[PDB]
Amino acid sequence: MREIVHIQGGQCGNQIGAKFWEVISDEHGIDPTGTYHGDSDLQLERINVYYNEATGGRYVPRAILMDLEPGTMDSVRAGPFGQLFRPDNFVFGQTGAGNNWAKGHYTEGAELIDSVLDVVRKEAEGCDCLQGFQITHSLGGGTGSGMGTLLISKVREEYPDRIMETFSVVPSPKVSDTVVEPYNATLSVHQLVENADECMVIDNEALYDICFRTLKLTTPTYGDLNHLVSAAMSGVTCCLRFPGQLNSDLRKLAVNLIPFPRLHFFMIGFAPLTSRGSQQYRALTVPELTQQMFDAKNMMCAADPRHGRYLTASALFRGRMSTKEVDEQMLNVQNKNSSYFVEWIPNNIKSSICDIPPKGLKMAVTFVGNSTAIQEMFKRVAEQFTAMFRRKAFLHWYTGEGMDEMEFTEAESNMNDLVSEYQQYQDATA
Amino acid sequence: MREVISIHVGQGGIQVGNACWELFCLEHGIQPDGQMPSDKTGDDAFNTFFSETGAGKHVPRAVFLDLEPTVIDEVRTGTYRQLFHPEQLISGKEDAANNFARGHYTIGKEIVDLCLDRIRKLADNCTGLQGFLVFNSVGGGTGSGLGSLLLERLSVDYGKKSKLGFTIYPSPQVSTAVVEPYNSILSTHSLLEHTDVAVMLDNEAIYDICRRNLDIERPTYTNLNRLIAQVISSLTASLRFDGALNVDITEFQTNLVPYPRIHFMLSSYAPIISAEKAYHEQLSVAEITNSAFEPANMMAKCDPRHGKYMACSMMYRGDVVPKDVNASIATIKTKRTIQFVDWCPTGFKVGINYQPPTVVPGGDLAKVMRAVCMISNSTAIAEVFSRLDHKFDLMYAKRAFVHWYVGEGMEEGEFSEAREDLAALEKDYEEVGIET
Amino acid sequence: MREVISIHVGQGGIQVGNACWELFCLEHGIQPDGQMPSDKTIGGGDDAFNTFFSETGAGKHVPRAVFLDLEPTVIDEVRTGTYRQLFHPEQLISGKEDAANNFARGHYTIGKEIVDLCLDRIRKLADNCTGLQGFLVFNSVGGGTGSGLGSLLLERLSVDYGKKSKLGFTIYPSPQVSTAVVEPYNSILSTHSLLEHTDVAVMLDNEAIYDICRRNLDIERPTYTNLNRLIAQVISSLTASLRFDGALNVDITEFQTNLVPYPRIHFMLSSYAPIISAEKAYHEQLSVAEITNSAFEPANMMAKCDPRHGKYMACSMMYRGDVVPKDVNASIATIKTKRTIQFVDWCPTGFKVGINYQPPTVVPGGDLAKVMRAVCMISNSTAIAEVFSRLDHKFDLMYAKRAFVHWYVGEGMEEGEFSEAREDLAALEKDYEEVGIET
Amino acid sequence: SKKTILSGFMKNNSIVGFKECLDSQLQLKDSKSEYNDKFQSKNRIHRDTSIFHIRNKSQII
Amino acid sequence: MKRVKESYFREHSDWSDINGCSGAKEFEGEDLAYDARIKYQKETQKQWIEQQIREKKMREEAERNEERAYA
Numbered sequence A: 001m002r003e004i005v006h007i008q009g010g011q012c013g014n015q016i017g018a019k020f021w022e023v024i025s026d027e028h029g030i031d032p033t034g035t036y037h038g039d040s041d042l043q044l045e046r047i048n049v050y051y052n053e054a055t056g057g058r059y060v061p062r063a064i065l066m067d068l069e070p071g072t073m074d075s076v077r078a079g080p081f082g083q084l085f086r087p088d089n090f091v092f093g094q095t096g097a098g099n100n101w102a103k104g105h106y107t108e109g110a111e112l113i114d115s116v117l118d119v120v121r122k123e124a125e126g127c128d129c130l131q132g133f134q135i136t137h138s139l140g141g142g143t144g145s146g147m148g149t150l151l152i153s154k155v156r157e158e159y160p161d162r163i164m165e166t167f168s169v170v171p172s173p174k175v176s177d178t179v180v181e182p183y184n185a186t187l188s189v190h191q192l193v194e195n196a197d198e199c200m201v202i203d204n205e206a207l208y209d210i211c212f213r214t215l216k217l218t219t220p221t222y223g224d225l226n227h228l229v230s231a232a233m234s235g236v237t238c239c240l241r242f243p244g245q246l247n248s249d250l251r252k253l254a255v256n257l258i259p260f261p262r263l264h265f266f267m268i269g270f271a272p273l274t275s276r277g278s279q280q281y282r283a284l285t286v287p288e289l290t291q292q293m294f295d296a297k298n299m300m301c302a303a304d305p306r307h308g309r310y311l312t313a314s315a316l317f318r319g320r321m322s323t324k325e326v327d328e329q330m331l332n333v334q335n336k337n338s339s340y341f342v343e344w345i346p347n348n349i350k351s352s353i354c355d356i357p358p359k360g361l362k363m364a365v366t367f368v369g370n371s372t373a374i375q376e377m378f379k380r381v382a383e384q385f386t387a388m389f390r391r392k393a394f395l396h397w398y399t400g401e402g403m404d405e406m407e408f409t410e411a412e413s414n415m416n417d418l419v420s421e422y423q424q425y426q427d428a429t430a
Numbered sequence B: 001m002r003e004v005i006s007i008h009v010g011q012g013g014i015q016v017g018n019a020c021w022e023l024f025c026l027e028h029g030i031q032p033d034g035q036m037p038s039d040k041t042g043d044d045a046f047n048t049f050f051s052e053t054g055a056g057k058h059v060p061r062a063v064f065l066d067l068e069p070t071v072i073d074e075v076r077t078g079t080y081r082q083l084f085h086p087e088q089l090i091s092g093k094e095d096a097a098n099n100f101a102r103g104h105y106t107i108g109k110e111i112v113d114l115c116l117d118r119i120r121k122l123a124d125n126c127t128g129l130q131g132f133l134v135f136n137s138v139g140g141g142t143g144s145g146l147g148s149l150l151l152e153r154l155s156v157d158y159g160k161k162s163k164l165g166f167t168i169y170p171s172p173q174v175s176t177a178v179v180e181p182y183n184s185i186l187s188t189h190s191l192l193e194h195t196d197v198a199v200m201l202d203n204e205a206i207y208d209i210c211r212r213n214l215d216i217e218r219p220t221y222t223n224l225n226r227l228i229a230q231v232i233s234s235l236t237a238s239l240r241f242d243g244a245l246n247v248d249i250t251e252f253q254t255n256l257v258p259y260p261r262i263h264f265m266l267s268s269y270a271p272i273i274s275a276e277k278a279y280h281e282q283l284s285v286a287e288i289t290n291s292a293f294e295p296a297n298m299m300a301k302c303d304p305r306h307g308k309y310m311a312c313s314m315m316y317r318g319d320v321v322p323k324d325v326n327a328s329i330a331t332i333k334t335k336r337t338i339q340f341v342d343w344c345p346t347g348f349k350v351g352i353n354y355q356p357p358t359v360v361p362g363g364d365l366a367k368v369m370r371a372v373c374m375i376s377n378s379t380a381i382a383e384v385f386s387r388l389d390h391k392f393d394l395m396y397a398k399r400a401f402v403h404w405y406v407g408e409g410m411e412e413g414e415f416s417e418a419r420e421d422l423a424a425l426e427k428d429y430e431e432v433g434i435e436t
Numbered sequence C: 001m002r003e004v005i006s007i008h009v010g011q012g013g014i015q016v017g018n019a020c021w022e023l024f025c026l027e028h029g030i031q032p033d034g035q036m037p038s039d040k041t042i043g044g045g046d047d048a049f050n051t052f053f054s055e056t057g058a059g060k061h062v063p064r065a066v067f068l069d070l071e072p073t074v075i076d077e078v079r080t081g082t083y084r085q086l087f088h089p090e091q092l093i094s095g096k097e098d099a100a101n102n103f104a105r106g107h108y109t110i111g112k113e114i115v116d117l118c119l120d121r122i123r124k125l126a127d128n129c130t131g132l133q134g135f136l137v138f139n140s141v142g143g144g145t146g147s148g149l150g151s152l153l154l155e156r157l158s159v160d161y162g163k164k165s166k167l168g169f170t171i172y173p174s175p176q177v178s179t180a181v182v183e184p185y186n187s188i189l190s191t192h193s194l195l196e197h198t199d200v201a202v203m204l205d206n207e208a209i210y211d212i213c214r215r216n217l218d219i220e221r222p223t224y225t226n227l228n229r230l231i232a233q234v235i236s237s238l239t240a241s242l243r244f245d246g247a248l249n250v251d252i253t254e255f256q257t258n259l260v261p262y263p264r265i266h267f268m269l270s271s272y273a274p275i276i277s278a279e280k281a282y283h284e285q286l287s288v289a290e291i292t293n294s295a296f297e298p299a300n301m302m303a304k305c306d307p308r309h310g311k312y313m314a315c316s317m318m319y320r321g322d323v324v325p326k327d328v329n330a331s332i333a334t335i336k337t338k339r340t341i342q343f344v345d346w347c348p349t350g351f352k353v354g355i356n357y358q359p360p361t362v363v364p365g366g367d368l369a370k371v372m373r374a375v376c377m378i379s380n381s382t383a384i385a386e387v388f389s390r391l392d393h394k395f396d397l398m399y400a401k402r403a404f405v406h407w408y409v410g411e412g413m414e415e416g417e418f419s420e421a422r423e424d425l426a427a428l429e430k431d432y433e434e435v436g437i438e439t
Numbered sequence D: 001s002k003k004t005i006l007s008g009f010m011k012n013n014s015i016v017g018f019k020e021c022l023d024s025q026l027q028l029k030d031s032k033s034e035y036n037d038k039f040q041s042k043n044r045i046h047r048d049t050s051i052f053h054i055r056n057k058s059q060i061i
Numbered sequence E: 001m002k003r004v005k006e007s008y009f010r011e012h013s014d015w016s017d018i019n020g021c022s023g024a025k026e027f028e029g030e031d032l033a034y035d036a037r038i039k040y041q042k043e044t045q046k047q048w049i050e051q052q053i054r055e056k057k058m059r060e061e062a063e064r065n066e067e068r069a070y071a
């Protein structure tokens, strides 16, 4: 029933998938052996959305894991709940990409794409009623940034009516781990803008900031970051798996969130988050939820919304709540901050309600906001790219396998055009 | 399923290979016999360096070459005699005697064929071969000649396979021989267009480090070999131990060498403290990463403060945490005495591995839960080339010692092209170092 | 998370460092070996020692100080001393050749071979701390190596940092008591250097402390150990508020915010009370009023100067013990009522008072008694010009016939530097003169 | 002692991929056949009309 | 290569251990063992000091003995 299949690639994508599948499995009450041990009816009517049924009464996730090196999947198989994934789904190369976007998009990914395309076609054809595809990947690593975009292009050429999501990890210039981030990041964005139906950006700097300031915990880790991001994924599609006061599908969110076809890059947020010491003080109410949800520092993107104007916003609530307070609070927050909302799109907030809360909570909020404040990410990325590119540094690695500087220049020009157009609507007035 | 092949030529190469293979064996828990540690009791990591013989013992994927038999005789008589395969310790009959021409044109060509046969016999076994490591004292005739010959032969036999050269250039003022400028320049002319990555291993800096830190006022070659082996292990741990952020051998030529002509780096290791005060300081990640960038801690006798930085690759092994690493990176960037080149906004590559550094019995270093190994490409390395150039021209002004090479099959002009290649390298470095 | 960095240079600097560091050791309860016997402290939390020591994770605590010398006798004595396990093995930098009381040797010939090592060690120590409050420096001005290295380090630090506060506890030769015969020359050169490179200078001449220990401690044969103990007690009283809780805390930044009206005139003189031996301590009352009265007599002063000959610009008082704010204010009121002490006209309010609760500690084998009240004094007054005038007279007398200048010109230092030093010091007395004039 | 014990006699006479199939696929009872599912039921003169309509979504197979 | 450990000291948790965590209320990044961890490792780390100290002194004796014989 309007189900979705999962695609994950790269070491980062595999690590995100390992936690997201754990979260969804625990929310649906499924053991790592694949046997149900839940307690409520609601955990099973819509179980076909994420799980396929095999003989013997067990469930298997409908995910496909890819990489150019075998270590990452041979490692995730050792993690908890690693038994769920089907060995036929794993696809790996024997070489790896080495953070070369050209290598992972032209030479090795080109020959590897056949098997993963075959399996994704089989998986899509098997399910009765498609809803869409979701991808999780990092733009800083060569294998992800190349292979994922190439697969996006290939599968978009085959399924033009299906909806597509990308959860993209954009490399920040503060917490920088490799020296070739600008090149593959720009080349990834150039291909992403043409094909991705929705793109949703996550920054490790923002994750560290929120973990350090809101959680106030001593030692963060990639596990904690994956925990936050997995909660973010579960929030958007909860109401697709459970009933509620107002159902809202991915297509509904897409219709109500993107005014123009080329403006589909979102910043998201999850509420509530509280420290261990402060969890016993705060009272979970709708005002607290919305005030934390519109907080600038709660955002999982380093971009600051108050530097720009919201094109539109969407909020998904989880738990048993009455619509009066939701609507009144959203009206009040729209009225009290009239400066930060562009005026020619009146009533630019969408709300949706699901009555099944996350296990252990009563009320939760997942927020997706299309704002013009994201332009600074692309501005700094393009600045670093042009500074490192004017001297033709780190270039022959990309040019040694069929790539030329014309593609680089075209990508830079396209990205700058996107930035200029995206800021054009910021100053538009009626 | 990933392997690397080790090549050790020259007396220094042999004397450092022995030290590094003691360390690898201790790391993987093998006894000198080559088996499991007796009958007191298999994670499958040894495949990176060792290969299972089919029944019990392990044979390393390394080859030793020499023209003078001596060191081969002692290694075949010592305690590791049963460990190595009897027919991979290639020994010649007459040494080149500090003559580059002898080892490049006269007597090494009869041994290079057997060496290539053995290299093929080791390579065909491997299936996911990452590449080759080569060790050679550059200031020696046979070492330089065979190192060259093997480099150009491998470059055409294999092609795209990666090779890493850990060469030991002569010190600015301390040297054992009197003719090493000639063969060092010729060897550099050879390796410039054939080696993917080259690393400085000058001996003066290591002597100074041992004197200042280990408090050893009478150190010998063994300590230097132990330090170099520690560098090797810190570099190659990532392939055989689990880590939060892994770096392969292929993830060096894509991050550390901005242009193909520029592939010479210099290294540093931290912490380097004698055990008598080693843990009377907390050895935190911040202080170890500051000591790593300290100019007095360079593995080569070069001062980075005289030039800019293009690339820095650091591998942390032990109890490091990414937040602490990033916090240290921020402080290093904010520090004013270290400046990066303009066209490189971010220049740090970072790798994390969980296996702690080891201590070797009879060693000098203390076994610590945290360590960092740094390899940097910076403009300051032109000074050593300049001083070697001056030393070479001082010799060549009166054509001294030239007969010893002319009479060995190589003609008069080869010095000219080597000098021109050095000049071109200096041109390239000082052209890159200028801001836009 | 608040730290200071200590610099000791010269033999006098090392000997003062020994006393101040043993005092800090006993105050914070750390053991000489460096391993704490462990406890839950009595003031200002358990982070107190962080002000002076640094944690190695567990075990020995490394003091935040650096020792410099060129003659290895005192450094070797410290290295073989009872604190051999306390100090870091290679932060005690020692040379080979002494400057031999010649400022030129220590400022132009053999200073550079050690200043770089000092700078590197300062780098390593400064990278440890996070909230560095400032630097303190200790040196003897009448000694060649101490003077030259102090001048060079101040000049180099002024450009290495700039805005960070530096305090200097200098010890001038006494008006008639001196050991060397050429100390006026290098004293004049050192002041000519440090006038432009020191935020706060404290005068600590030796004849006055001799008179103090003679009159008060009833000791007819004191030695430098007693003087160093008094200096250490002064330092501890000055810096206690940084680590011990009190009603009115005073930071290091609230000295160059209350004591130096203009950047030029930053030389101050410090007094202490009570200074009494145990046997006669059985008599008096030890009240705040009488201790603050005792802090004001020129006979109690540790600088050989007479404030009755000039006006006071500023006053800083640091009380410690069981003092009461109302009692302190009453004492200030009585002092202002008193006529024999006159303030300058343009300074209607001239007192900065701080209160700390921890009473002072007594070192075993010492000479002071255990007291429940103490007050420390840092005053800036116009009477300080007389010492400068006296050294002017002595230097003029010795330079009238150009004696000993052959050496000073022989190590590369030029002939003329004496003249500009004379002009600078003369401008200094002149400035201190028109400062005190009434409008 | 991981793969050193191999020998030709043991190697070839050992079925590896076509031995007994894994469980949870054995689950059919051999004798139970057609005409026997229903024609061998029992049959009975008066049927039972009790039919239950549970308020749960029917499982789809 | 592999990532079998989330952090270096603690391994992954048992499936029984992760009972909830669908909502973000427990993170295990709050540690709750930081001071104990440091205090524990530092003591054994001192022990490595003193053990190396015996080795140093023993080889020091062994390096005087032969010259004592040579005299």
Ligand SMILES: Nc1nc2c(ncn2[C@@H]2O[C@H](COP(=O)(O)OP(=O)(O)OP(=O)(O)O)[C@@H](O)[C@H]2O)c(=O)[nH]1
Pocket: B009, B010, B011, B012, B013, B015, B016, B068, B095, B096, B097, B098, B099, B137, B138, B139, B140, B141, B142, B143, B144, B168, B170, B175, B176, B177, B203, B221, B222, B224, B225
């Ligand atoms: N770092 C280091 N360098 C060494 C060592 N042994 C020799 N060397 C260097 O090697 C140079 C001379 O070459 P050798 O290694 O002795 O012998 P070779 O390389 O085979 O060349 P030939 O002497 O012609 O046989 C010396 O100048 C040393 O600098 C060593 O153990 N460690």
Ligand SMILES: Nc1nc2c(ncn2[C@@H]2O[C@H](COP(=O)(O)OP(=O)(O)OP(=O)(O)O)[C@@H](O)[C@H]2O)c(=O)[nH]1
Pocket: C009, C010, C011, C012, C013, C015, C016, C071, C098, C099, C100, C101, C102, C140, C141, C142, C143, C144, C145, C146, C147, C171, C178, C179, C180, C206, C224, C225, C227, C228
């Ligand atoms: N009050 C006091 N003064 C000291 C002490 N030690 C040294 N001095 C002063 O130092 C001056 C002489 O210099 P020294 O300390 O002997 O040596 P230096 O300062 O390092 O300079 P050099 O003599 O060149 O080595 C004397 O005039 C003393 O006033 C001390 O322990 N107490």
Ligand SMILES: Nc1nc2c(ncn2[C@@H]2O[C@H](COP(=O)(O)OP(=O)(O)O)[C@@H](O)[C@H]2O)c(=O)[nH]1
Pocket: A009, A010, A011, A012, A013, A015, A016, A099, A138, A140, A141, A142, A143, A144, A145, A169, A171, A176, A177, A178, A204, A222, A225, A226
């Ligand atoms: N959120 C998250 N980010 C990660 C993780 N591992 C790596 N990264 C980020 O991804 C960047 C490198 O990604 P990379 O390993 O090259 O991705 P790949 O090339 O697809 O394998 C680094 O800058 C990290 O900040 C993870 O487990 N979670």
Ligand SMILES: [Mg+2]
Pocket: B011, B068, B095, B140
């Ligand atoms: Mg030799």
Ligand SMILES: [Mg+2]
Pocket: C010, C011, C071, C098, C145
């Ligand atoms: Mg002296």
